[PDB]
Amino acid sequence: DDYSLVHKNILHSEDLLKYILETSAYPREHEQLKGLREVTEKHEWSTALVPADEGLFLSMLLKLMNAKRTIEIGVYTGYSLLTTALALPEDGKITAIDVNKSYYEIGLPFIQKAGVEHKINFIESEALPVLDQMLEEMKEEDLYDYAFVDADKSNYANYHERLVKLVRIGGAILYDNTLWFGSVAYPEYPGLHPEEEVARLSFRNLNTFLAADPRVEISQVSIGDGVTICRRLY
Amino acid sequence: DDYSLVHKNILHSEDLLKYILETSAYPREHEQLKGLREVTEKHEWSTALVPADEGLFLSMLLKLMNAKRTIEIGVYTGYSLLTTALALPEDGKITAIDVNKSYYEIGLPFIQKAGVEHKINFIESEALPVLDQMLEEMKEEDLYDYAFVDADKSNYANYHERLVKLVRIGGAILYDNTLWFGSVAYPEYPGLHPEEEVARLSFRNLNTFLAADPRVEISQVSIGDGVTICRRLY
Numbered sequence: 162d163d164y165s166l167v168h169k170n171i172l173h174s175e176d177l178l179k180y181i182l183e184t185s186a187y188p189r190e191h192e193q194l195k196g197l198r199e200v201t202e203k204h205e206w207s208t209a210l211v212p213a214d215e216g217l218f219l220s221m222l223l224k225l226m227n228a229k230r231t232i233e234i235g236v237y238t239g240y241s242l243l244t245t246a247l248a249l250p251e252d253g254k255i256t257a258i259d260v261n262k263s264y265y266e267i268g269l270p271f272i273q274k275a276g277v278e279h280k281i282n283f284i285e286s287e288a289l290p291v292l293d294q295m296l297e298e299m300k301e302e303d304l305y306d307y308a309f310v311d312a313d314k315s316n317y318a319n320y321h322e323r324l325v326k327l328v329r330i331g332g333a334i335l336y337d338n339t340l341w342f343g344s345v346a347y348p349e350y351p352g353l354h355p356e357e358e359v360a361r362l363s364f365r366n367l368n369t370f371l372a373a374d375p376r377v378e379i380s381q382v383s384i385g386d387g388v389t390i391c392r393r394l395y
Numbered sequence: 396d397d398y399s400l401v402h403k404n405i406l407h408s409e410d411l412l413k414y415i416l417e418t419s420a421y422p423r424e425h426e427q428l429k430g431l432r433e434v435t436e437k438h439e440w441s442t443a444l445v446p447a448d449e450g451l452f453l454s455m456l457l458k459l460m461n462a463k464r465t466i467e468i469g470v471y472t473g474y475s476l477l478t479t480a481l482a483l484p485e486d487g488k489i490t491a492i493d494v495n496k497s498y499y500e501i502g503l504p505f506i507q508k509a510g511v512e513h514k515i516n517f518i519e520s521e522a523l524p525v526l527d528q529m530l531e532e533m534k535e536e537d538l539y540d541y542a543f544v545d546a547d548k549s550n551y552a553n554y555h556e557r558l559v560k561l562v563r564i565g566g567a568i569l570y571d572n573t574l575w576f577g578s579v580a581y582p583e584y585p586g587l588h589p590e591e592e593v594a595r596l597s598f599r600n601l602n603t604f605l606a607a608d609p610r611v612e613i614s615q616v617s618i619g620d621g622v623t624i625c626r627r628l629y
């Protein structure tokens with residue numbers, strides 16, 4: 162491993178995190194989500210995997226807002242993507258974007274056996290070109306209800322400017338890792354990989370920008386590695 | 396000096412929580428919410444106050460699900476109540492319940508100055524008798540969209556049995572403090588005040604029960620002191 166923060170928790174002990182997962186997450190986790198998580202935990206990049214308790218939170222948000230059309234930026238093996246597909250109705254639709262389809266192929270068998278692959282349109286590409294072509298093509302009747310952003314960390318602010326125009330008014334945009342293992346809380350943080358430090362500063366700037374952005378109402382939630390929920394106002 | 400958990404938090408550092416509050420919560424806090432909070436912080440029971448980052452999270456949930464009729468169990472000085480009243484549409488209605496209206500009159504001037512007191516029907520009573528009386532008069536078209544539970548901790552299970560019938564299908568029930576300062580993570584916990592130990596054992600039982608309850612979907616969110624979101628399935 163080259164990164165420095167992968168094992169740091171934002172809760173005060175591993176025992177508390179394990180209590181949550183063992184008591185409230187794992188018993189509610191779909192069988193195909195469990196299988197996808199177990200394979201992914203063996204992968205070299207398992208650090209980026211969305212945790213099980215955050216997954217149930219994302220699923221709860223989708224259902225309470227009755228989302229039907231979503232976009233997912235940053236798929237990896239597809240844990241949050243499968244979570245989103247399982248939450249949506251039978252005729253829901255998802256646009257999933259990732260640069261590395263081979264990651265998606267790892268979790269695709271579990272997605273298929275869950276019987277929800279028909280809801281997914283997977284696009285193997287960088288997100289910004291796809292988002293720009295979406296804005297050139299999108300009609301007002303096609304705007305998304307929900308957007309989950311979990312890709313290139315230093316590019317969140319760029320995704321934001323596109324997504325505030327691609328989600329409906331009252332729709333939700335969620336940014337993953339906005340607390341970045343807790344390292345955002347200080348002006349400086351020693352011992353980090355160079356691109357770990359770029360992400361840290363990018364999130365510090367992003368969090369300040371989102372709090373002042375009048376186009377949205379926000380809520381930063383200390384779940385997982387930190388999730389910031391945005392709701393488009395106009 | 397009499398209760399043991401009051402100086403504990405579930406995040407790994409006070410600095411991270413301060414970062415969240417200062418970066419994301421306080422800049423989005425209504426001026427009357429800021430006033431109610433700052434007078435409450437000088438009250439003897441200020442430890443029971445719903446924090447600012449959790450308050451914005453409740454506000455986000457209410458708007459994303461388009462809540463109109465809500466019920467609030469456990470008001471205290473009214474921070475979460477005022478948060479709810481400011482999040483609902485102008486025609487929103489709240490049933491607020493608390494055994495001690497003296498606490499409520501600490502925050503009522505801020506609720507009035509915010510211009511939202513017209514949304515609130517306050518009932519000075521124990522919660523259970525009111526909920527039982529609601530079960531006899533409730534009409535199917537009068538079910539609540541949303542319920543925030545934050546009263547006597549040892550009675551949450553009794554509240555749940557009423558609320559899964561008073562909240563509409565697809566409505567939300569939120570239980571505050573379900574992580575109880577992290578103390579629920581161990582079967583035995585040392586040196587608590589007898590009432591803190593009763594609440595701890597009550598939350599351990601409630602968390603296990605809710606995870607197995609087929610009437611609801613759940614998400615335990617490690618925000619504040621832990622909030623368990625329930626969604627009624629039938």
Ligand SMILES: Nc1ncnc2c1ncn2[C@@H]1O[C@H](CSCC[C@H](N)C(=O)O)[C@@H](O)[C@H]1O
Binds near residue numbers: 237238260311
């Ligand atoms: N510019 C870019 N455009 C689209 N995807 C990108 C990208 N840069 C990196 N990514 C992808 O973003 C992913 C981040 S890991 C995301 C984890 C996933 N949300 C889960 O539920 O586990 C990686 O798979 C990486 O391939």
Ligand SMILES: Nc1ncnc2c1ncn2[C@@H]1O[C@H](CSCC[C@H](N)C(=O)O)[C@@H](O)[C@H]1O
Binds near residue numbers: 443444475493
């Ligand atoms: N049996 C009961 N029925 C109704 N309220 C009760 C109760 N037992 C205790 N309470 C009330 O529940 C409250 C818990 S403190 C609640 C904090 C409040 N939700 C906030 O936003 O800050 C106390 O005010 C207490 O008076």
Ligand SMILES: Oc1ccc(CCNCc2ccc(O)c(O)c2)cc1
Binds near residue numbers: 442445548590594
């Ligand atoms: O009967 C009790 C139970 C617990 C205590 C100590 C904890 N203080 C209460 C508290 C703390 C945080 C909250 O969010 C809340 O609703 C309430 C004291 C008397």
Ligand SMILES: [Mg+2]
Binds near residue numbers: 209210211311337338
């Ligand atoms: Mg992530």
Ligand SMILES: [Mg+2]
Binds near residue numbers: 443445545572
């Ligand atoms: Mg509470």
